[PDB]
From a paper:
Here, we show that high-quality structures can indeed be obtained using 1.1 MHz repetition rate pulses from the European XFEL using currently available operating conditions (September 2017 and March 2018, proposal p2012). We present two complete data sets, one from the well-known model system in crystallography, lysozyme and the other from a so far unknown complex of a β-lactamase from Klebsiella pneumoniae involved in antibiotic resistance. The results obtained for HEWL and CTX-M-14 demonstrate that SFX using X-ray pulses with megahertz repetition rates is suitable for high-resolution structure determination using the methods described in this paper under the exposure conditions currently available at the European XFEL.
Numbering used by the authors: 27 to 57, 59 to 238, 240 to 288
The structure:
């Protein structure tokens, strides 16, 4: 297929390893490139942690309003929102929003804590039928993105399927799903990734991530106007530990998928 040849060429031009999964919910068709290879998730894993807490809130109806202390000891490498509330509290809703929309790593660690450790996040993946996702570590070490290391990885195919179920499907209750969709649509970190390769008019909710080995990721739900939505996962990683991020590769992959 032409899309396959163009993604392969993009990959060749980039010097890295590119993973793409597209699901067209119009006809449930899929486009995959290295769809079954493992990639480090880095911050894209936060969608699963947030969704897991939302699933808890279906029975614990006030859970999202639960205050959680932010202490100095809780701060890690990237805490844009949590640092604003040190020695105070944030609710689990606020932590979820911070994790998703600003990619706050302290917020992610509080979500993991709420779920009883990385094993609790992974259990939620298994619960909704994702047998591929694995979260092994907490922030910041889950972003080491070491080649061949299976920790904290998933595949593009798996992540696309799961993101579909969480946002467009019914893995979550209706109020929860709507909340997740709202958070994703309000992401502030994605302008140069998938979004940059799509028609400006299209509505996108996404979660970015990056890590060592120039790992550069984005997962997205896309709502074209007058057309069934799409799920697009783009993972990218490189052979040098100190490689720079390549968000342009993700934008380019999205463009190739969109029809450009
Ligand atoms: C997620 O991959 N991380 C936390 C934060 N994410 O910002 S990003 O999604 O815009 O890339 C910074 C990078 C990364 C990390 N190494 O902690």
């Amino acid at each position: 297929s032409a899309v396959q040849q163009k993604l392969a060429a993009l990959e060749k031009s980039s010097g890295g390893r590119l993973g793409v999964a597209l699901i067209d919910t119009a006809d449930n068709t899929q486009v995959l490139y290295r769809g079954d290879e493992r990639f480090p998730m880095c911050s894209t894993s936060k969608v699963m942690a947030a969704a897991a807490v939302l699933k808890q809130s279906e029975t614990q109806k006030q859970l999202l309003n639960q205050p959680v202390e932010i202490k100095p000891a809780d701060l890690v490498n990237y805490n844009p929102i949590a640092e604003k509330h040190v020695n105070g509290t944030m609710t689990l809703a606020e932590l979820s929003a911070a994790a998703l929309q600003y990619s706050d790593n302290t917020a992610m660690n509080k979500l993991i804590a709420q779920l009883g450790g990385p094993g609790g996040v992974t259990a939620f993946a298994r619960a909704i039928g994702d047998e591929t996702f694995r979260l092994d570590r907490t922030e910041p070490t889950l972003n080491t993105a070491i080649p061949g290391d299976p920790r904290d990885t998933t595949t593009p195919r798996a992540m696309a399927q799961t993101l579909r179920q969480l946002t467009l499907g019914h893995a979550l209750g209706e109020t929860q799903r709507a909340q997740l969709v709202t958070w994703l649509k309000g992401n502030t970190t994605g302008a140069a990734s998938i979004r940059a390769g799509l028609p400006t008019s299209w509505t996108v909710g996404d979660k970015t991530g990056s890590g060592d080995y120039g790992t550069t990721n984005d997962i997205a739900v896309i709502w074209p106007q007058g057309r069934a939505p799409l799920v697009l996962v783009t993972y990218f990683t490189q052979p040098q530990q100190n490689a720079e991020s390549r968000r342009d590769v993700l934008a380019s992959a999205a463009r190739i998928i969109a029809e450009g």
